[PDB]
């Protein structure tokens, strides 16, 4: 039922605004039949504290980090942690130019901002 | 309008996904025509029917969403195949392959790993709204 949509450094900057996506985010996860609590954050301590409630509660992450998707044991050992499945998502193609992905159950890149919305469909199918 | 749903060595001998390919195949076009669309899904295990149909959809430019399997680490000959791709070309994983190196990705619009056969399906959703 409820999935965290959780967001990193440099995605407070962020073509949509801050709040576009998350008002994206939110209804296709009404639509879907979910509630998404989208969070975004650019200090890793306030990233692993939502990670490790998501642990806690055994409840569905979307995870997209910027900078610390390619430097950050801390953020991999939390989301070892996760009970309920993670899909990492990005935006941009990162394998042009990850910690995570041995620890997330799927991945999604390159797909836009629509990369948020299709990891819903997956955990509301799913 | 046409979407080229294409399969590399093995995919045929499922039985990864649970569902078999016969099922599989069938489940992605059910699910194209809901989103408006002909999903052309194809296998082969010879790795020059793959680079034909790449070439194909290449040259009526149309996109692709390939799942190769064991050819998408060691196969070069499939990333200049891609290369050639104008269109989308989203690549597909049903396990989570994160073998962490994949040629295609860099040249490959987006991928999808470790969603079971429901990649492909997310896959054609990108295309029809993209």
Same mark, same amino acid.
């Given at each position: 039922?409820?999935? &965290?949509?959780? &967001? ?10 801050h709040? @576009?996506?998350?008002? *994206?985010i ?8 979910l ?5 975004? =954050?650019? =200090? @890793? ?18 995870? &997209?980090?910027?900078?610390?998707? $390619?430097?950050?044991?801390?953020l ?5 942690? *996760?009970?309920?499945? #993670?899909? @990492?998502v $990005?935006? =941009?193609?990162? $394998?042009?130019?990850?910690?995570? =992905? ?11 901002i629509?990369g948020?919305? #299709?990891? *819903?469909?997956?955990?509301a @199918? $799913?």
């Amino acid at each position: 039922l409820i999935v &965290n949509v959780i &967001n990193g450094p440099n995605l407070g900057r962020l073509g949509t605004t801050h709040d @576009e996506l998350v008002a *994206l985010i939110e209804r296709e996860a009404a639509e879907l039949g979910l509630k998404a609590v989208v969070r975004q =954050s650019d =200090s @890793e301590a306030q990233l692993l504290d939502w990670i490790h409630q998501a642990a806690d509660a055994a409840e569905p992450v979307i995870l &997209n980090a910027g900078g610390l998707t $390619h430097t950050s044991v801390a953020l991999r050992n939390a989301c070892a942690e *996760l009970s309920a499945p #993670l899909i @990492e998502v $990005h935006i =941009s193609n990162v $394998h042009a130019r990850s910690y995570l =992905s041995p620890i997330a159950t799927g991945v999604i890149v390159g797909l836009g901002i629509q990369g948020y919305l #299709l990891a *819903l469909r997956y955990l509301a @199918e $799913h």
